[PDB]
Amino acid sequence: QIQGHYELKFEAVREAFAALFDDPQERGAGLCIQVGGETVVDLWAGSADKDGREAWHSDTIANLFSCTKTFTAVTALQLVGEGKLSLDAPVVRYWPEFGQAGKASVTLRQLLSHRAGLPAIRELLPAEALYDWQAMVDALAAEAPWWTPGTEHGYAAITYGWLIGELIRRVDGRGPGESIVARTARPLGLDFHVGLADEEFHRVAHIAREPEALSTRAFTNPPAILTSTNKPEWRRMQQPAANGHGNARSLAGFYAGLLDGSLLESELLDELTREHSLGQDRTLLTQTRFGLGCMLDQPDVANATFGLGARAFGHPGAGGSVGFADPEYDVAFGFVTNTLGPYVLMDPRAQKLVRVLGTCL
Numbered sequence: 001q002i003q004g005h006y007e008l009k010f011e012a013v014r015e016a017f018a019a020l021f022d023d024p025q026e027r028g029a030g031l032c033i034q035v036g037g038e039t040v041v042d043l044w045a046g047s048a049d050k051d052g053r054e055a056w057h058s059d060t061i062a063n064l065f066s067c068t069k070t071f072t073a074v075t076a077l078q079l080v081g082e083g084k085l086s087l088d089a090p091v092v093r094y095w096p097e098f099g100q101a102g103k104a105s106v107t108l109r110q111l112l113s114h115r116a117g118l119p120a121i122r123e124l125l126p127a128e129a130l131y132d133w134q135a136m137v138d139a140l141a142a143e144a145p146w147w148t149p150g151t152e153h154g155y156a157a158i159t160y161g162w163l164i165g166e167l168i169r170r171v172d173g174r175g176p177g178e179s180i181v182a183r184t185a186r187p188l189g190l191d192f193h194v195g196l197a198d199e200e201f202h203r204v205a206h207i208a209r210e211p212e213a214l215s216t217r218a219f220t221n222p223p224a225i226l227t228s229t230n231k232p233e234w235r236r237m238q239q240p241a242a243n244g245h246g247n248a249r250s251l252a253g254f255y256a257g258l259l260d261g262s263l264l265e266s267e268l269l270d271e272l273t274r275e276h277s278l279g280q281d282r283t284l285l286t287q288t289r290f291g292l293g294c295m296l297d298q299p300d301v302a303n304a305t306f307g308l309g310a311r312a313f314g315h316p317g318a319g320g321s322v323g324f325a326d327p328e329y330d331v332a333f334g335f336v337t338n339t340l341g342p343y344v345l346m347d348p349r350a351q352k353l354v355r356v357l358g359t360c361l
Contacts, residue, residue, distance in 0.1 A: 028044070
């Protein structure tokens with residue numbers, strides 16, 4: 001049963017959302033769209049658990065994977081605004097140990113745009129290493145760049161979490177998850193978590209099924225990351241690249257907060273959405289386009305378009321969840337699924353939903 005509300009003008013979006021569940025593997029999903037800060041679509045449907053015994057509620061939340069990266073980037077840019085970070089200062093200034101193995105001149109701008117050259121860790125780590133914050137931060141401090149920093153880009157699927165998170169932790173004097181939720185979620189009352197208390201576990205959807213395939217193991221080192229998404233420890237840890245918990249409504253609320261100037265001053269939003277990386281991704285081996293911790297629309301690239309205007313910015317998660325803002329149409333878009341597809345970038349399910357929204361506008 002499709003639940004929630006829509007303006008009659010967007011009935012086609014409700015129809016397309018219903019069409020998702022014509023596929024029997026679809027378990028649960030949420031879809032939320034704001035136009036000019038007005039919620040025109042707020043839909044959810046199906047089940048949250050693996051076995052269809054617990055229905056998807058309005059307040060059902062889920063792992064949003066790399067949807068998280070833009071929340072983390074916005075947190076970093078606020079710290080820049082407050083003079084606690086500089087985009088073009090060498091990180092050593094905040095994180096002196098980072099300066100090992102050729103990283104004496106690596107900047108926050110390079111880390112946010114995937115140009116720093118730390119897409120993955122070379123030495124294959126045990127699964128537990130993931131849950132040891134100090135171990136992962138010490139590993140990355142000691143890790144050599146995979147290319148001359150600033151000269152190429154390669155998507156940093158999970159390493160991004162410790163790289164930006166450690167800088168957040170050192171300059172904001174609290175855990176990076178606490179910083180992100182305090183700066184991007186609380187001010188707007190978004191149902192969004194980086195580090196999830198057990199009191200909330202009751203309303204968490206069960207996640208089920210190229211990413212594992214990659215020669216650059218951005219997703220699979222430490223191993224069993226995307227096979228551990230439903231683990232309590234994974235929920236409780238702070239992973240600013242990967243473990244943000246929320247739904248379509250939090251995603252839409254965050255992006256509406258970006259469009260209306262709630263979360264970033266216009267100068268800092270101009271930096272976030274400025275093209276920093278365009279071309280063959282050294283991790284994904286496909287044409288990617290990055291701002292600071294967001295992807296920018298490529299209108300003629302099938303797997304790398306949000307499905308609306310050329311100025312759309314945001315970040316999909318592996319498996320098909322996506323949030324973005326389109327300043328041309330004043331759109332804030334959120335889609336959450338617990339049924340992961342095989343795409344790291346745009347999922348065709350999400351692109352069709354956006355394209356039907358496009359028709360209604």
